[PDB]
Amino acid sequence: GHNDYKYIIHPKNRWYKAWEMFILVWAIYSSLFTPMEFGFFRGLPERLFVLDIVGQIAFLVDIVLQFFVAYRDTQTYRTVYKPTRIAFRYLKSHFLMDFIGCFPWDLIYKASGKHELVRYLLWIRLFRVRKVVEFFQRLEKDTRINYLFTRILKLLFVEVYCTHTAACIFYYLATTLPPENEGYTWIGSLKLGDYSYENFREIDLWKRYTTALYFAIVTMATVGYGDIHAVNLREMIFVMIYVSFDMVLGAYLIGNITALIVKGSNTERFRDKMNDLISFMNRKKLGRDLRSQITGHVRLQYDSH
Amino acid sequence: GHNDYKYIIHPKNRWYKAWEMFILVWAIYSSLFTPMEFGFFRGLPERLFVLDIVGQIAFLVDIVLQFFVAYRDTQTYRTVYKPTRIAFRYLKSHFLMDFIGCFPWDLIYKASGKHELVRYLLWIRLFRVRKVVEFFQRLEKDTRINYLFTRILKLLFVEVYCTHTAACIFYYLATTLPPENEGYTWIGSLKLGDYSYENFREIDLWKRYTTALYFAIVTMATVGYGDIHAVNLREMIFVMIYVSFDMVLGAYLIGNITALIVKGSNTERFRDKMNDLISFMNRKKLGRDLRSQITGHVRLQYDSH
Amino acid sequence: GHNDYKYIIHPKNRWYKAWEMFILVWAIYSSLFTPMEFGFFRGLPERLFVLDIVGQIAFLVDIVLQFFVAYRDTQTYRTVYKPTRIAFRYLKSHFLMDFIGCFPWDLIYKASGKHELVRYLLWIRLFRVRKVVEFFQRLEKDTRINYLFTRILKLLFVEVYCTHTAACIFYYLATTLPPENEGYTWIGSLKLGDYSYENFREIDLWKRYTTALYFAIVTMATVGYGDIHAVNLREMIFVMIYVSFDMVLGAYLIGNITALIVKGSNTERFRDKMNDLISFMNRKKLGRDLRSQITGHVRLQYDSH
Amino acid sequence: GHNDYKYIIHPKNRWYKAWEMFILVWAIYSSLFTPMEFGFFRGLPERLFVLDIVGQIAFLVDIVLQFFVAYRDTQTYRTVYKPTRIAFRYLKSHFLMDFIGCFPWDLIYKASGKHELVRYLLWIRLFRVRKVVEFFQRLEKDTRINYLFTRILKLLFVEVYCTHTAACIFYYLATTLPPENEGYTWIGSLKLGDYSYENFREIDLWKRYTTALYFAIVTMATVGYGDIHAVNLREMIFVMIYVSFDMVLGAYLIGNITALIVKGSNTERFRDKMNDLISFMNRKKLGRDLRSQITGHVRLQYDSH
């Protein structure tokens, strides 16, 4: 019903759904790479320079594309296709964060005399998780999948993101101290087996990330070996914040899993009904013939709904 | 006849709800600073003197103000303005503890030749958490702030209070040994990174508090890296008490969160019914028109009942 | 209701109930001390020799008492008064483990050439925890206390008792190595702070017990600091067993706490009713006078049942 | 149709049930020993040469009998005794994996010049855990044992299997490094007590396995002492994978146990009502005779009316 608004793309268009999946994949990488770019590099190496610029370009198109995309209203509950209303809705809803996230923050950091506060603007690109939140909302609205399983998946994804981000921030806090005071950081004072993470800034990127993620994963599960631990006061405060948040997050995970199991399965509804029928049967002693007939018939009833 | 017993403050009038919020903030600060004044300060410094005095002054005003504020008597559900009943209720319920908490315990301890037992009286000021409990009761009665979140917010407040108090008591137990025996304390033997907490009484207040709070949060979160751990026998006993209490309290937090997720939402029960009916509809394929009719009928139960 | 059998005691007599409480206290003490006698001493020191004797006497009397105490039948629900039936039921229910527990196992251990296997018969006195089990059964039968709260209390007692027993067994396993191989034990290699548990068998009893209980409590909450950890293979096996059992025990504690919170409070039931009524009035836009009347009258209904 | 084609065994035949129980034990042993044979042996010693071969024999026979035993249809709900029908079921469902697992993979590894990738094929024998899965499925459809309790037993078996397999893989990852780099492995740098695991390949098999299983068990319960921990990057990655999976699995264990407790019992449901009735009756101070009448009437209801 938008013959007048021919330019506007239907949100259920097949090609726009393909673009939604493509930009969902791009958003996952961007919101996972951004913490690593901010934590393990003080300026992106040239080898992945293109991966920076291209990474924003795919999002820039989205900024344009979302301007030519209709939507379903929340008060009228009618699918609104007015291009001016579309533009105003996206300008006042999410345009600012998406647009500011596509700035060449690495190039701006390197051009502006290597100022760290400029690099702190990379965290705007964590607002690209809005794509994943929208994907999980859509998949929760999907009646095919169980609703509480969707919540469990969303919580596990949040745990993955928070653990990865916590690892990147934990390594970054070690980098916030000068290398001379590196012995007062968690990684600069770290010694695992024979290996000593002495000049940790010059260790391979993936060794550093694996160590930080190992600490973050081990803390997230509340195992807590101690091999890696906070040493600074800043590391101290960050670990307190992270474990306090992850305590509530793990409690929510346990609660959601328990709610899924408490909901019960038809198999269980059938098992309980079986036990009730057996109680009745043994309290009236029907007889093996009628007993077996009843059991078989009710099994077939539960099987055939 | 409010004019008869004038100058009696109605419980829920303006300018007394503002004072209730003001004294709530003071109660939170006093009930959080008290553990720190006791654990990290054998003697409060001149720098804090005025602040300390000011705190008691506020609560002193509270003691006066609560002698004039009317109350709803639960056996008649009216608001009694008679000053004798107000004073009698204050004297019976909680006046002695409130009054004792307002004593200049810090100055009294100093003016008594620095007797540690006088400084244990500071713990009376932890009864000011009755204001936080009252605020949480009122918030629970509130409908806008749903009982849903507030039930676990109360437990998170309890977690924060207990962790902070445990950190303060842990540091205090470290101080209960003489400094020459400081190598047998948890902090005196601490060598986090290249920094050793050699003379821990001369370390900055905030580094010591951050260390103790990190241990307490680490223990509460059940991570237990062990970088920081009990060393004294008194430290073992305190850690055992705190650990058992925190196991029970964390189980309570998980149980409260699980119950909020199990209770579920009207939408959620509607989504259960919709999932069942959509599964049956796909199994017994019946067309979009009958689908629409039955789904609209179902949607006229979650929104009509 | 027994003329012929005058020598039989009702299990409701205030004298027998007082003796039941007295022997419950004695059984709690004996079940708690038996592990300590086995783990921290290769033979009881003379100082508490009398305590070894009189306590057994305290249970020996009970062995006699249950031979002429009436018992309520299961199916008939009639308190059987026949001394022959009472004696036979006691003889085949718990007489053997009570009588074996009442033997002077310390004196028998010392007389039989200090043969270590004789001291393993001390574990028969673990069966005196049946009095605590029966106490909790009666408590859960009592209506003055919530059933699920009684289950939580039973689980907490089980956790406490298993932690204490695990601490005693851990120390015992340390003592199962010769004092020359003590460097391979968990406590003989312990260097908490500047204190070293070198000659750990000559350390003060409460110092050793507090250390073992600290390890057991810290493992029980799964804090797991690491300061104290299994070193032997036998210590490793015991830690695996205790950890695996404690995992299920903690899961059961969480489940029971959740179940109680899920069962819900009348306050929460009212909060949900109030939310439903407020939704109704908001939909129908009832005037503030009538809405306030409805709210107040519903509060009074809930308070006055 | 059991007369038309002979040599066909009824699925619930007594001899076939005995063979099912026998091959269940064999499958449990095989799927528990396969991780141990993979991780702790780079080639099975000849001391076990018979024990592996016989094992495969036990499953080879199990492959043959699977070509004769009948099955109950999911469509016609009736047993089919037809060799052509029987063979197709096996050939499609599980023949291929069972046959590959029956191969002498140790002999093939030793006859192929000791290639480790050949030894990786032992993990096919982990599909014999399908026998345990089928046994638990049959146990679920049994009135003697609760459904949710069967589920928690399944999850406890899953925890046992996953912990043992994780221990074996953890040791194997240490062996993937050359012995000269053993100081970088988790076990090669282990110095528990006064014992150092220097030449960890020459340590007794059961000492190494007990150490690895200790680590895996303490991390499964999230105790995380720290004494044993990952050192290589491969060790960190495996610990992260195992720790995340075990976080989810422990949350599932807690959820299953909590659902079993929340489900409740008819007795517990009765106690809930009877507690309410006792509160009401004590509130109104009702007569004992009418109390007995009401309590008996309610006891009638909570008896599966």
mmCIF file with all atom_site columns, N, CA and C in Angstrom, chain A residues 55-86:
data_model
loop_
_atom_site.group_PDB
_atom_site.id
_atom_site.type_symbol
_atom_site.label_atom_id
_atom_site.label_alt_id
_atom_site.label_comp_id
_atom_site.label_asym_id
_atom_site.label_entity_id
_atom_site.label_seq_id
_atom_site.pdbx_PDB_ins_code
_atom_site.Cartn_x
_atom_site.Cartn_y
_atom_site.Cartn_z
_atom_site.occupancy
_atom_site.B_iso_or_equiv
_atom_site.pdbx_formal_charge
_atom_site.auth_seq_id
_atom_site.auth_comp_id
_atom_site.auth_asym_id
_atom_site.auth_atom_id
_atom_site.pdbx_PDB_model_num
ATOM 1  N N  . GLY A 1 55 ? 34.995 -1.850 7.030  1.00 0.00 ? 55 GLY A N  1
ATOM 2  C CA . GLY A 1 55 ? 34.084 -2.176 8.112  1.00 0.00 ? 55 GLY A CA 1
ATOM 3  C C  . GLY A 1 55 ? 33.057 -1.087 8.342  1.00 0.00 ? 55 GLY A C  1
ATOM 4  N N  . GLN A 1 56 ? 33.475 0.170  8.199  1.00 0.00 ? 56 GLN A N  1
ATOM 5  C CA . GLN A 1 56 ? 32.533 1.270  8.347  1.00 0.00 ? 56 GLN A CA 1
ATOM 6  C C  . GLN A 1 56 ? 31.651 1.435  7.120  1.00 0.00 ? 56 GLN A C  1
ATOM 7  N N  . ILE A 1 57 ? 32.189 1.172  5.926  1.00 0.00 ? 57 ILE A N  1
ATOM 8  C CA . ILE A 1 57 ? 31.436 1.432  4.701  1.00 0.00 ? 57 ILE A CA 1
ATOM 9  C C  . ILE A 1 57 ? 30.177 0.577  4.665  1.00 0.00 ? 57 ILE A C  1
ATOM 10 N N  . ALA A 1 58 ? 30.313 -0.711 4.993  1.00 0.00 ? 58 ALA A N  1
ATOM 11 C CA . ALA A 1 58 ? 29.151 -1.589 5.051  1.00 0.00 ? 58 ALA A CA 1
ATOM 12 C C  . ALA A 1 58 ? 28.101 -1.061 6.015  1.00 0.00 ? 58 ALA A C  1
ATOM 13 N N  . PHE A 1 59 ? 28.528 -0.405 7.095  1.00 0.00 ? 59 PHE A N  1
ATOM 14 C CA . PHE A 1 59 ? 27.563 0.203  8.000  1.00 0.00 ? 59 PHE A CA 1
ATOM 15 C C  . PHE A 1 59 ? 27.022 1.513  7.454  1.00 0.00 ? 59 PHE A C  1
ATOM 16 N N  . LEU A 1 60 ? 27.852 2.286  6.747  1.00 0.00 ? 60 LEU A N  1
ATOM 17 C CA . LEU A 1 60 ? 27.386 3.555  6.201  1.00 0.00 ? 60 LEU A CA 1
ATOM 18 C C  . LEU A 1 60 ? 26.202 3.345  5.270  1.00 0.00 ? 60 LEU A C  1
ATOM 19 N N  . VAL A 1 61 ? 26.283 2.328  4.409  1.00 0.00 ? 61 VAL A N  1
ATOM 20 C CA . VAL A 1 61 ? 25.158 1.980  3.549  1.00 0.00 ? 61 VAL A CA 1
ATOM 21 C C  . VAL A 1 61 ? 23.911 1.745  4.387  1.00 0.00 ? 61 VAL A C  1
ATOM 22 N N  . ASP A 1 62 ? 24.057 1.008  5.492  1.00 0.00 ? 62 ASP A N  1
ATOM 23 C CA . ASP A 1 62 ? 22.926 0.775  6.380  1.00 0.00 ? 62 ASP A CA 1
ATOM 24 C C  . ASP A 1 62 ? 22.321 2.087  6.856  1.00 0.00 ? 62 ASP A C  1
ATOM 25 N N  . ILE A 1 63 ? 23.166 3.052  7.235  1.00 0.00 ? 63 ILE A N  1
ATOM 26 C CA . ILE A 1 63 ? 22.655 4.357  7.651  1.00 0.00 ? 63 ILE A CA 1
ATOM 27 C C  . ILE A 1 63 ? 21.790 4.955  6.552  1.00 0.00 ? 63 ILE A C  1
ATOM 28 N N  . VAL A 1 64 ? 22.242 4.859  5.302  1.00 0.00 ? 64 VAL A N  1
ATOM 29 C CA . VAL A 1 64 ? 21.412 5.300  4.189  1.00 0.00 ? 64 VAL A CA 1
ATOM 30 C C  . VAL A 1 64 ? 20.205 4.385  4.031  1.00 0.00 ? 64 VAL A C  1
ATOM 31 N N  . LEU A 1 65 ? 20.425 3.068  4.097  1.00 0.00 ? 65 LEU A N  1
ATOM 32 C CA . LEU A 1 65 ? 19.360 2.121  3.783  1.00 0.00 ? 65 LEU A CA 1
ATOM 33 C C  . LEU A 1 65 ? 18.204 2.248  4.763  1.00 0.00 ? 65 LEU A C  1
ATOM 34 N N  . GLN A 1 66 ? 18.515 2.460  6.041  1.00 0.00 ? 66 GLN A N  1
ATOM 35 C CA . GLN A 1 66 ? 17.474 2.578  7.050  1.00 0.00 ? 66 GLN A CA 1
ATOM 36 C C  . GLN A 1 66 ? 16.605 3.805  6.811  1.00 0.00 ? 66 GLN A C  1
ATOM 37 N N  . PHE A 1 67 ? 17.104 4.781  6.047  1.00 0.00 ? 67 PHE A N  1
ATOM 38 C CA . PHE A 1 67 ? 16.290 5.942  5.704  1.00 0.00 ? 67 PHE A CA 1
ATOM 39 C C  . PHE A 1 67 ? 15.233 5.616  4.660  1.00 0.00 ? 67 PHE A C  1
ATOM 40 N N  . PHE A 1 68 ? 15.428 4.559  3.879  1.00 0.00 ? 68 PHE A N  1
ATOM 41 C CA . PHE A 1 68 ? 14.511 4.171  2.816  1.00 0.00 ? 68 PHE A CA 1
ATOM 42 C C  . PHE A 1 68 ? 13.799 2.869  3.162  1.00 0.00 ? 68 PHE A C  1
ATOM 43 N N  . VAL A 1 69 ? 13.492 2.669  4.440  1.00 0.00 ? 69 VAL A N  1
ATOM 44 C CA . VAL A 1 69 ? 12.903 1.423  4.914  1.00 0.00 ? 69 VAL A CA 1
ATOM 45 C C  . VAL A 1 69 ? 11.696 1.752  5.780  1.00 0.00 ? 69 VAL A C  1
ATOM 46 N N  . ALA A 1 70 ? 10.570 1.097  5.503  1.00 0.00 ? 70 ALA A N  1
ATOM 47 C CA . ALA A 1 70 ? 9.329  1.348  6.222  1.00 0.00 ? 70 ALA A CA 1
ATOM 48 C C  . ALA A 1 70 ? 9.371  0.652  7.581  1.00 0.00 ? 70 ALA A C  1
ATOM 49 N N  . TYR A 1 71 ? 8.329  0.846  8.385  1.00 0.00 ? 71 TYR A N  1
ATOM 50 C CA . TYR A 1 71 ? 8.302  0.271  9.722  1.00 0.00 ? 71 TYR A CA 1
ATOM 51 C C  . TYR A 1 71 ? 6.858  0.107  10.164 1.00 0.00 ? 71 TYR A C  1
ATOM 52 N N  . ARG A 1 72 ? 6.670  -0.729 11.180 1.00 0.00 ? 72 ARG A N  1
ATOM 53 C CA . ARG A 1 72 ? 5.365  -0.936 11.788 1.00 0.00 ? 72 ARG A CA 1
ATOM 54 C C  . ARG A 1 72 ? 5.233  -0.065 13.029 1.00 0.00 ? 72 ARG A C  1
ATOM 55 N N  . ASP A 1 73 ? 4.126  0.668  13.112 1.00 0.00 ? 73 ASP A N  1
ATOM 56 C CA . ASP A 1 73 ? 3.919  1.583  14.222 1.00 0.00 ? 73 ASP A CA 1
ATOM 57 C C  . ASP A 1 73 ? 3.673  0.816  15.518 1.00 0.00 ? 73 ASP A C  1
ATOM 58 N N  . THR A 1 74 ? 3.929  1.494  16.636 1.00 0.00 ? 74 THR A N  1
ATOM 59 C CA . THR A 1 74 ? 3.714  0.928  17.958 1.00 0.00 ? 74 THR A CA 1
ATOM 60 C C  . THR A 1 74 ? 2.437  1.422  18.623 1.00 0.00 ? 74 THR A C  1
ATOM 61 N N  . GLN A 1 75 ? 1.936  2.595  18.243 1.00 0.00 ? 75 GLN A N  1
ATOM 62 C CA . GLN A 1 75 ? 0.674  3.117  18.752 1.00 0.00 ? 75 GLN A CA 1
ATOM 63 C C  . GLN A 1 75 ? -0.493 2.802  17.831 1.00 0.00 ? 75 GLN A C  1
ATOM 64 N N  . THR A 1 76 ? -0.356 3.097  16.539 1.00 0.00 ? 76 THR A N  1
ATOM 65 C CA . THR A 1 76 ? -1.364 2.743  15.551 1.00 0.00 ? 76 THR A CA 1
ATOM 66 C C  . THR A 1 76 ? -1.319 1.267  15.178 1.00 0.00 ? 76 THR A C  1
ATOM 67 N N  . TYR A 1 77 ? -0.155 0.628  15.316 1.00 0.00 ? 77 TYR A N  1
ATOM 68 C CA . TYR A 1 77 ? 0.056  -0.763 14.904 1.00 0.00 ? 77 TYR A CA 1
ATOM 69 C C  . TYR A 1 77 ? -0.178 -0.936 13.404 1.00 0.00 ? 77 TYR A C  1
ATOM 70 N N  . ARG A 1 78 ? -0.005 0.151  12.656 1.00 0.00 ? 78 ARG A N  1
ATOM 71 C CA . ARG A 1 78 ? -0.067 0.141  11.204 1.00 0.00 ? 78 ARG A CA 1
ATOM 72 C C  . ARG A 1 78 ? 1.329  0.360  10.642 1.00 0.00 ? 78 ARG A C  1
ATOM 73 N N  . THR A 1 79 ? 1.652  -0.377 9.584  1.00 0.00 ? 79 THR A N  1
ATOM 74 C CA . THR A 1 79 ? 2.950  -0.258 8.934  1.00 0.00 ? 79 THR A CA 1
ATOM 75 C C  . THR A 1 79 ? 3.087  1.087  8.226  1.00 0.00 ? 79 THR A C  1
ATOM 76 N N  . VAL A 1 80 ? 3.917  1.974  8.780  1.00 0.00 ? 80 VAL A N  1
ATOM 77 C CA . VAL A 1 80 ? 4.024  3.343  8.281  1.00 0.00 ? 80 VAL A CA 1
ATOM 78 C C  . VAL A 1 80 ? 5.071  3.405  7.177  1.00 0.00 ? 80 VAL A C  1
ATOM 79 N N  . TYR A 1 81 ? 4.687  3.944  6.017  1.00 0.00 ? 81 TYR A N  1
ATOM 80 C CA . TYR A 1 81 ? 5.591  4.077  4.880  1.00 0.00 ? 81 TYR A CA 1
ATOM 81 C C  . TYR A 1 81 ? 5.855  5.526  4.484  1.00 0.00 ? 81 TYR A C  1
ATOM 82 N N  . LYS A 1 82 ? 5.528  6.490  5.334  1.00 0.00 ? 82 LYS A N  1
ATOM 83 C CA . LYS A 1 82 ? 5.777  7.890  4.992  1.00 0.00 ? 82 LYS A CA 1
ATOM 84 C C  . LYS A 1 82 ? 7.273  8.171  5.010  1.00 0.00 ? 82 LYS A C  1
ATOM 85 N N  . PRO A 1 83 ? 7.878  8.568  3.886  1.00 0.00 ? 83 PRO A N  1
ATOM 86 C CA . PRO A 1 83 ? 9.336  8.772  3.874  1.00 0.00 ? 83 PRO A CA 1
ATOM 87 C C  . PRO A 1 83 ? 9.811  9.834  4.849  1.00 0.00 ? 83 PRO A C  1
ATOM 88 N N  . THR A 1 84 ? 9.075  10.936 4.997  1.00 0.00 ? 84 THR A N  1
ATOM 89 C CA . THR A 1 84 ? 9.468  11.956 5.964  1.00 0.00 ? 84 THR A CA 1
ATOM 90 C C  . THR A 1 84 ? 9.340  11.432 7.388  1.00 0.00 ? 84 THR A C  1
ATOM 91 N N  . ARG A 1 85 ? 8.257  10.705 7.673  1.00 0.00 ? 85 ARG A N  1
ATOM 92 C CA . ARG A 1 85 ? 8.104  10.098 8.989  1.00 0.00 ? 85 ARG A CA 1
ATOM 93 C C  . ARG A 1 85 ? 9.188  9.062  9.245  1.00 0.00 ? 85 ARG A C  1
ATOM 94 N N  . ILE A 1 86 ? 9.544  8.281  8.223  1.00 0.00 ? 86 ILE A N  1
ATOM 95 C CA . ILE A 1 86 ? 10.657 7.343  8.335  1.00 0.00 ? 86 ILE A CA 1
ATOM 96 C C  . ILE A 1 86 ? 11.936 8.078  8.711  1.00 0.00 ? 86 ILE A C  1
#
